[PDB]
Amino acid sequence: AAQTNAPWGLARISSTSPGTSTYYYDESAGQGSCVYVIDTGIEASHPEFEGRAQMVKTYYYSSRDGNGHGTHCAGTVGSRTYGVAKKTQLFGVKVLDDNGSGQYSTIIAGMDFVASDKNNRNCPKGVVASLSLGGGYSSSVNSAAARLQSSGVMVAVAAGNNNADARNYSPASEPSVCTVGASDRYDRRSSFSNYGSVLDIFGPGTDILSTWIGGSTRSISGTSMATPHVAGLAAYLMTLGKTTAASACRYIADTANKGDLSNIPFGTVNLLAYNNYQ
Ligand SMILES: [Ca+2]
Domain extents for the chain? 1-278
Q: Cα(88) to centroid of ligand 1, in Å? A: 23
CA–CA distance, 155 with 18 (Å, rounded to integer) = 26
Nearest to 153 by CA among 131, 132, 136: 131
Q: Is 177 annotated as a binding residue?
A: yes
Backbone phi and psi for residue 22, each to the nearest 5 degrees, phi listed first = -105, 135
Backbone phi and psi for residue 225, each to the nearest 5 degrees, phi listed first = -90, -25
Residues 111-145 as b/e (b if ≥16 CB within 10 A, e otherwise) read: bebbbebbeeeebebbbbbbbbbbbeebeebbebb
Q: Do residues 203 and 183 touch, judged by C-beta distance below 8 A?
A: yes
CA–CA distance, 221 with 242 (Å, rounded to integer) = 30
Neighbours of 173 (CB within 10 A): 28
Q: Is 153 annotated as a binding residue?
A: no
Per the DSSP assignment, residues forming a β-bridge with 220 are 208
CA–CA distance, 122 with 104 (Å, rounded to integer) = 29
Query: What residues act catalytically?
Result: 39, 69, 224
CA–CA distance, 98 with 265 (Å, rounded to integer) = 35
The structure's method of determination equals: electron diffraction
Contacts of 143 (CB under 8 A, 6+ apart): 174
In this structure, the strands spanning 169-170 and 135-136 are: antiparallel
Cis before residue 171, ω within 30 degrees of 0? yes
Nearest to 158 by CA among 126, 129, 185: 129
Q: Cα(216) to centroid of ligand 1, in Å? A: 34
The 3-class secondary structure across the chain, one letter per residue, is CEECCCCHHHHHCCCCCCCCCCEECCCCCCCCEEEEEEECCCCCCCHHHCCCEEEEEECCCCCCCCCCHHHHHHHHHHCCCCCCCCCCEEEEEECCCCCCCCCHHHHHHHHHHHHHHHHHCCCCCEEEEEECCCEECCHHHHHHHHHHHHCCEEEEEECCCCCCEHHHEECCCCCCCEEEEEECCCCEECCCCCECCCCCEEEECCCEEEECCCCCEEEECCHHHHHHHHHHHHHHHHHCCCCCCCCHHHHHHHCCEECCCECCCCCCCCEECCCCCC
Contacts of 132 (CB under 8 A, 6+ apart): 37, 38, 39, 69, 70, 73, 158, 222, 223, 224, 225, 227, 228
CA–CA distance, 120 with 259 (Å, rounded to integer) = 41
CA–CA distance, 125 with 78 (Å, rounded to integer) = 15
CA–CA distance, 152 with 244 (Å, rounded to integer) = 9
Identify residue 226 by its one-letter amino acid code: A
CA–CA distance, 100 with 275 (Å, rounded to integer) = 30
Q: Cα(179) to centroid of ligand 1, in Å? A: 6
CA–CA distance, 133 with 36 (Å, rounded to integer) = 13
Nearest to 73 by CA among 266, 201, 203: 203
Q: Which CATH architecture has domain 1-278?
A: 3-Layer(aba) Sandwich (3.40)
Q: Is 117 annotated as a binding residue?
A: no
Q: Cα(167) to centroid of ligand 1, in Å? A: 12
CA–CA distance, 160 with 192 (Å, rounded to integer) = 8
CA–CA distance, 66 with 88 (Å, rounded to integer) = 23
Q: Is 207 annotated as a binding residue?
A: no
Per the DSSP assignment, residues forming a β-bridge with 39 are 94
CA–CA distance, 19 with 40 (Å, rounded to integer) = 31
Backbone phi and psi for residue 231, each to the nearest 5 degrees, phi listed first = -60, -45
In Å, how far are 10, 86, 146, 210 from 6, measured between CA atoms?
6, 12, 34, 11
